[PDB]
Design an enzyme around this catalytic site. Sequence first.
Site, short mmCIF file in Angstrom:
data_model
loop_
_atom_site.label_atom_id
_atom_site.label_comp_id
_atom_site.label_asym_id
_atom_site.label_seq_id
_atom_site.Cartn_x
_atom_site.Cartn_y
_atom_site.Cartn_z
N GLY A 19 0.81 -1.19 0.00
CA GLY A 19 0.00 0.00 0.00
C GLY A 19 0.85 1.25 0.00
N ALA A 20 0.27 2.38 0.41
CA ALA A 20 1.02 3.62 0.45
C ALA A 20 1.87 3.71 1.70
CB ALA A 20 0.06 4.81 0.39
N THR A 23 3.10 0.56 3.83
CA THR A 23 2.16 -0.48 4.22
C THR A 23 2.39 -1.74 3.38
OG1 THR A 23 0.45 1.00 5.05
CG2 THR A 23 -0.27 -1.13 4.17
N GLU A 82 -10.52 -9.77 6.60
CA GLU A 82 -10.93 -10.87 5.74
C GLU A 82 -9.97 -11.06 4.57
OE1 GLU A 82 -14.99 -10.61 4.67
OE2 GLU A 82 -14.85 -12.12 3.08
N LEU A 83 -9.53 -12.30 4.39
CA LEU A 83 -8.71 -12.66 3.23
C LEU A 83 -9.59 -12.74 1.99
CD1 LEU A 83 -5.96 -13.43 2.12
CD2 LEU A 83 -6.38 -15.76 2.84
N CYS A 84 -9.15 -12.10 0.92
CA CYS A 84 -9.91 -12.04 -0.32
C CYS A 84 -9.10 -12.67 -1.44
CB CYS A 84 -10.28 -10.59 -0.66
SG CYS A 84 -11.38 -9.80 0.55
N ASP A 127 -11.30 7.40 -1.39
CA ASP A 127 -10.18 6.81 -2.13
C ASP A 127 -10.62 5.52 -2.82
OD1 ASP A 127 -7.56 6.58 -3.13
OD2 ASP A 127 -6.96 5.32 -1.44
N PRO A 130 -10.30 0.64 -8.32
CA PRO A 130 -10.29 -0.82 -8.51
C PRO A 130 -9.29 -1.53 -7.62
CG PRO A 130 -10.40 0.29 -10.64
CD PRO A 130 -10.14 1.36 -9.61
N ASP A 150 -9.87 -0.70 2.76
CA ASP A 150 -8.87 0.36 2.87
C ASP A 150 -9.45 1.67 3.39
OD1 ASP A 150 -6.44 1.65 2.77
OD2 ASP A 150 -6.06 1.18 0.65
#
EC number: 2.7.11.1
Lengths: 398, 398
Positions: A19-20, A23, A82-84, A127, A130, A150
């Site tokens: 992430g940003a 992260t 949650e795992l996606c 924010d 996709p 997020d």
Amino acid sequence: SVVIVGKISFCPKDVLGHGAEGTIVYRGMFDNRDVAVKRILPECFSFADREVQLLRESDEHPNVIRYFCTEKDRQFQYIAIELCAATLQEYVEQKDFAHLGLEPITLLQQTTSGLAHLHSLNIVHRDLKPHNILISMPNAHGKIKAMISDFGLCKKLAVGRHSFSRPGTEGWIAPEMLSEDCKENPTYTVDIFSAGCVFYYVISEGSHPFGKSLQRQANILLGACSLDCLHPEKHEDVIARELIEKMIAMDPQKRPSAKHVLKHPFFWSLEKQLQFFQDVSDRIEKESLDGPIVKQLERGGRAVVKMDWRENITVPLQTDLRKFRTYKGGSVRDLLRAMRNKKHHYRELPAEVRETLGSLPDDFVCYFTSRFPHLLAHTYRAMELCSHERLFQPYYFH
Amino acid sequence: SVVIVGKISFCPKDVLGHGAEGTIVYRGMFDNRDVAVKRILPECFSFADREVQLLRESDEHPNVIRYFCTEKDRQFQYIAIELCAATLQEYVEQKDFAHLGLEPITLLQQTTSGLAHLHSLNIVHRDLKPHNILISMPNAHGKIKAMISDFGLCKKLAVGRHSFSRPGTEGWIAPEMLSEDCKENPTYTVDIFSAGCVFYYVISEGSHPFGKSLQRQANILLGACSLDCLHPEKHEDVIARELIEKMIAMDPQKRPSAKHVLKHPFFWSLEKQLQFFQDVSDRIEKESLDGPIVKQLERGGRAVVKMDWRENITVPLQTDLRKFRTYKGGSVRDLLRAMRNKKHHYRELPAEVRETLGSLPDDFVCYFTSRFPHLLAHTYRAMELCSHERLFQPYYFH
Ligand SMILES: O=c1cc(-c2[nH]nc3ncc(-c4c(F)cccc4F)cc23)nc(N2CCC(O)CC2)[nH]1
Ligand SMILES: O=c1cc(-c2[nH]nc3ncc(-c4c(F)cccc4F)cc23)nc(N2CCC(O)CC2)[nH]1
């Protein structure tokens, strides 16, 4: 090496993504569940606290990612969620849509429901894109769903507040977030703008209303958008165009709320489309030819009907309609009456007429929307006049 | 003193209630959430493990209690689950229903949805009762919901299995669970039986189809039930009676599945009730007077119509219907046609006729179901013949 910080466990080799601002997202474990483990640097601790709080408030909805636990150590903070299986980006980038049916539109519907739930809690996401709309792993019956994730940049509006002061990922940012010509402060509709760009990105399988990625945000500020993946003579594209151009309007006050988006014909089943046609046919039946309803319904009606709609249907239907009433070929209202007539008496009609129409309701309504691609969109706009009446509450949001 | 076992925290003074075999339920904390903390003695560790596993599988549904975490120490095991405001028992025992509207029936609907979700995962609850159907705390918009809890006695059926071998709370146990006359093994319908007793318990505000608590289970085995809180000449009670007596049938194979229960008119809105009347009116319009459909529809039709239905409606309606068609007073089909006729042309009718009917759709349909309390139930049973056709899928489960 395998890290264990409190009840959260993961192995640094199982990196899912980044992430940003440092992260990292890992695959991990919590309470013998497979989970996603989000690791946040000390510089972003105020964003992790914001995310934890807002996930606690909103993760009960099925299209908001479920939150499990948080823990810290000397170095970082850890969030178990949650795992996606995928992001919407890779879904659009990799999945063959030919055999997915209405699943892409259902993902957009689920995203919008999650957004509506956030907005109903006075939370603006700010924010949406996709990269952080997630595709669930299949449940025990093989079904998948979209989830919003997020929440580090979300804003919680205070009780009594409808705006916030003036943050996102370049290319998906509503114009009033970046332009100094800010009459009104940004509100929930910044998420509608982003969602509208996401809607187009999914149905076009990769394009963006404001162009290629390097020029995108500059085009947003200029209002230069293009939806030309949507063909103007295809019913489904006409309907999607009508919604999307309102979602991405430069004027925020012209964008519909999330709940308004959810009522749009873009999401109606074929059965619901036909019921709308029947319900409007009954409403305008004993209506005055000079009245405001039929006036709105007939304004620009020549092009909707293709000059003469009786000349644009199959001959077996054309021979059948001449017998009883004989309709007017330039009226949208009369086109709707013929449709309503043939659905009501569908099993009285001869086998030749039932053949070219197809079965009720799905094939029957497609017989008409395929040949009159603007009929539903036009009728939906005209009958906004009746959006407050009881009969039309399934179709418009109040 | 305040206990802290892992991430679960509670104070032994905050006891919410007690369960079987030494189980105590406390108010507590987990991850800075208020939670319920379930404390299980070592003798029931195999039931806590069963509960944890089955909650992990099924708590995603909104009407199954959410599960948070589990932990052990030397002495006990602890389960952290969603904190709830009440049990259904105290809701029925304490709440004034006069100003709750359809909220009680909505609680039954939500219970049934949670049950259907369990059954869809091949989980039978086996101990459903008011004591463990929980009422949520209000969400941010003041709304409450029912949730199924207490999974210690649930059975997970193996893949390919539809029955289990042969456990509950006396008074709510399906007969095939206790009688040796067990042709077929018990299946999911043991939960339907219990639910049916719960349905009656809620709408009667405290009674049980099989009598007072000391004699209840003996009456279940004998098949001696009584639903006489339901008046036989009130539409809502007729509909509820029809469903409940099937839910508590002695023969398990005659009880409907949870999804079947969810389609029953007991749960239809008033709008949906009127749409069913209109849809059946259209289906039987060009039907043969000797056919099986109208035969079923007219069998026992004299009592449904009250000898002559034209003599049992208000005079302003009676004067209006004589003009155009003049209907047959002994036919249920003709009663349905008049209703359909007056709804379609509702805004053509004179103000006197629109006055005694009331507004569309809610008051209009109550005008008829109030005066013909058996009409909907009778029509619903007769039109089971058409339960497979497309038009009637909103009304019957396949
Ligand atoms: O708040 C969050 C929560 C999550 C998240 N929570 N559960 C997840 N399960 C899987 C994945 C995932 C992935 F990481 C890469 C490819 C496919 C995948 F499915 C991500 C997950 N991810 C991010 N980020 C920031 C934006 C980035 O585009 C992705 C990572 N942020
Ligand atoms: O598995 C479970 C889960 C829960 C449970 N989980 N969250 C809860 N929140 C509140 C209450 C609760 C209460 F305890 C007494 C009065 C009002 C209340 F709302 C119970 C809760 N309770 C039990 N038991 C066994 C059956 C007994 O009748 C009740 C206790 N079993």
